Design a protein around this ligand. Structure first.
Ligand code: NAG
Lengths: 104, 440
């Protein structure tokens, strides 16, 4: 037979027939390389510490997306609020804002 | 001097601590629990073994009738069968074809081997803890079997140690246990006088040599075969042997926390649970003033080797310029690293090597020596072995294995987004102020 068992840092022992019990402990070794490209880092910190990377990576991605969307929203609102006072002039003369910031 | 420390109850792993005073040299205290025992108080409820059905020789009355002698023995039964015609090697026993009677009588006794092959049913409660500690304080080393109740001190060289009480009241044995063949089983055996046929405790004795015996084996008497002298009976098969067929593994194979179950006395050893609180009362004689002890100066720590393995997978070399030779109680106040040595020899000038175990990929701790506080940093690498045969000496912090590239990426994602938000807020405020001031 071939039997696989999961050994963690807490410990794990087996008794095979009349042999004395043998104890084994896991050890943080593999796989991947934390001092490398993002995919290797994610692989290393997913195989080790599972469910603490999937949660953390998702939280970070959500925060980044919300921040980017909010920044874009504020930038567009600022552009509208700085252009419409100059934009809806009947002759539409807009030199000052375009010269000081190039909003358009 | 009084100290109150707490050490994990992990057998075979040394634990080092340092004691500091305002004007006294630091002193190292090393405790090594070689064996931690847990001995519940047990009461012998009863003893069960294989039974033996004993039959009295049939009472054959020819051309007559008999009566049932009243019952006085364990599971004892008597019955009179009429119309029997027994035979022997000589020939027919009775001369009447009918109206002959045979009294059959059976009972239950302990087997002849109950003195050796028996199982003892115990009630287990009130666990007590003892610890075999190698204790080294002030270069004074002893071995003591200290009780882990908070009431009893142990004294040596004016030093008092009060251990316990244990942090956790957990025990592997439950209320009712069964000892058989040097193994302990968590079995809910029936109470004395409540045994059932074909199950454990179907016959019960208060003691292996006791004169009492409760028997309940569903013994019944069948009619003897025609022309035969014997006592037929029908019983539920032995409950002890059936229990031995379906014991399930003992406690030494099914106990949590790696406990090792032993008998005589019934105890659990080396349970990796809880923590022992130690209270120290140290006389001032062992303490030495700062002037007497060597004072360290011009010390630098270099991590010439580090692997974050379970064992001491790191070596730190410290360059020192000490006032005089002596002993330093080398210690790391933080939990970053665990030091193999609680004390190090010190010379006038040179380099000292210290073996440490860390779980940090990028360690940086404040190594304390006789008086100095060196700041020691470096890098560690994953070890060769996927699996080892010893528990981890160090402790795992939440941010232990997090590298530095992960910090850079996390700060860029969490910290760059905040920068973008700040930029957007500043731009919005500037635009609003500009338009508001340009209305008038
Ligand atoms: C504890 O002391 C005993 C008695 O000398 C010794 O045999 C044993 O090796 C010591 N334990 C350790 C871990 O050094």
């Amino acid at each position: 037979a071939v039997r696989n068992f999961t050994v963690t840092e807490k410990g794990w022992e087996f008794v095979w027939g009349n042999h004395p019990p043998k104890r084994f402990w896991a050890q943080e070794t593999a796989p991947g390389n934390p001092h490398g490209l993002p995919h290797e880092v994610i692989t290393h910190y997913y195989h080790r510490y599972p469910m603490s990377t999937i949660l953390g990576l998702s939280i970070c991605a959500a925060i980044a997306t919300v921040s980017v969307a909010a920044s874009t929203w504020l930038f567009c609102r600022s552009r509208v609020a700085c252009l419409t006072p100059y934009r809806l002039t009947p002759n539409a003369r807009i030199p000052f804002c375009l010269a000081v910031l190039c909003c358009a | 001097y009084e100290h109150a420390t707490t050490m994990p109850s992990q057998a075979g792993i040394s634990y080092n601590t340092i004691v500091n005073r305002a004007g006294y040299a630091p002193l190292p205290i090393s405790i090594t629990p070689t064996k931690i025992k847990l001995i519940p108080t047990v009461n012998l409820e009863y003893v069960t073994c294989h039974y033996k059905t004993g039959m009295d020789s049939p009472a054959i009355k020819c051309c007559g009738s008999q009566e049932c002698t009243p019952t006085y023995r364990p599971d004892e039964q008597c019955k009179v069968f009429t119309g029997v015609y027994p035979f022997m090697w000589g020939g027919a026993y009775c001369f009447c074809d009918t109206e002959n009677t045979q009294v059959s009588k059976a009972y239950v006794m302990k087997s002849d081997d109950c003195l050796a092959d028996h199982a003892e049913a115990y009630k287990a409660h009130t666990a007590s803890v003892q610890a075999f500690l190698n204790i080294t304080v002030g270069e004074h080393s002893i071995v003591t079997t200290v009780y882990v109740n908070g009431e009893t001190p142990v004294n040596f060289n004016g030093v008092k140690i009060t251990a316990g009480p244990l942090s956790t009241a957990w025990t592997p044995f439950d209320r009712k246990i069964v000892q058989y063949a040097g193994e302990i089983y968590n079995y809910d055996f029936p109470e004395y006088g409540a045994g059932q046929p074909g199950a454990f405790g179907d016959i019960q004795s208060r003691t292996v040599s006791s004169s009492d015996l409760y028997a309940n084996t569903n013994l019944v008497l069948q009619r003897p075969k025609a022309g035969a002298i014997h006592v037929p009976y029908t019983q539920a098969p032995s409950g002890f042997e059936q229990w031995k067929k379906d014991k399930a593994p003992s406690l030494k194979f099914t106990a949590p926390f790696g406990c090792e179950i032993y008998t005589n006395p019934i105890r659990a050893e080396n349970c990796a649970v809880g923590s022992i609180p130690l209270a120290f009362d140290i006389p001032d004689a062992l303490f030495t003033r700062v002037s007497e002890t060597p004072t360290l100066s011009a010390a630098e720590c270099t991590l010439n080797e580090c692997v974050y393995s379970s064992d001491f997978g790191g070596i730190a070399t410290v360059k020192y310029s000490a006032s005089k030779s002596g002993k330093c109680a080398v210690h790391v106040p933080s939990g970053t690293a665990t030091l193999k040595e609680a004390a190090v020899e010190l010379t006038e000038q040179g380099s000292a090597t210290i073996h440490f175990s860390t779980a940090n990929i990028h360690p940086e701790f404040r190594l304390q020596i006789c008086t100095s506080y060196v700041t020691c940093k470096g890098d560690c690498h994953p070890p060769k072995d996927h699996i080892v045969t010893h528990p981890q000496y160090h402790a795992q912090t939440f941010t232990a294995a997090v590298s530095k590239t992960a910090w850079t990426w996390l700060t860029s994602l969490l910290g760059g987004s905040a920068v973008i938000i700040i930029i957007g807020l500043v731009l919005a405020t500037i635009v609003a102020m500009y338009v508001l001031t340009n209305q008038k």
